[PDB]
Structure 1
Amino acid sequence: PPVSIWLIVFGVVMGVIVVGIVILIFTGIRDR
């Protein structure tokens, strides 16, 4: 395979997680 499937899944999962963290950090700042 041109790209390892595990890396592409890893890619998409890490993506969502960090976009999760960004928003949560900002929602809390708004709460302040």
Structure 2
Amino acid sequence: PPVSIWLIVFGVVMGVIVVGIVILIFTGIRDR
């Protein structure tokens, strides 16, 4: 395996969660 498969799953999950995190903060900053 050229790249450890967990890292490319971890990456997708972490990317989606940080995108969620910034969306929710801006949503809360725009609902006040």
The TM-score bracket by the shorter chain reads: over 0.9
| C-alpha RMSD over aligned residues | 0.3
**How many equivalent residue pairs?**
32
Deviation of 1:31 after TM superposition, in Å, equals 0.3
**TM superposition outliers: structure 1 runs of 4+ over 2 Å:** none
Aligned to 1:8: 8
Structure 2 residue runs of 5 or longer lacking an equivalent are none
Structure 1 residue runs of 5 or longer lacking an equivalent are none
TM-score, scaled to structure 1: 0.95
Deviation of 1:18 after TM superposition, in Å, equals 0.2
TM-score, scaled to structure 2: 0.95
Secondary structure, aligned partner of 1:10: helix
Deviation of 1:26 after TM superposition, in Å, equals 0.2
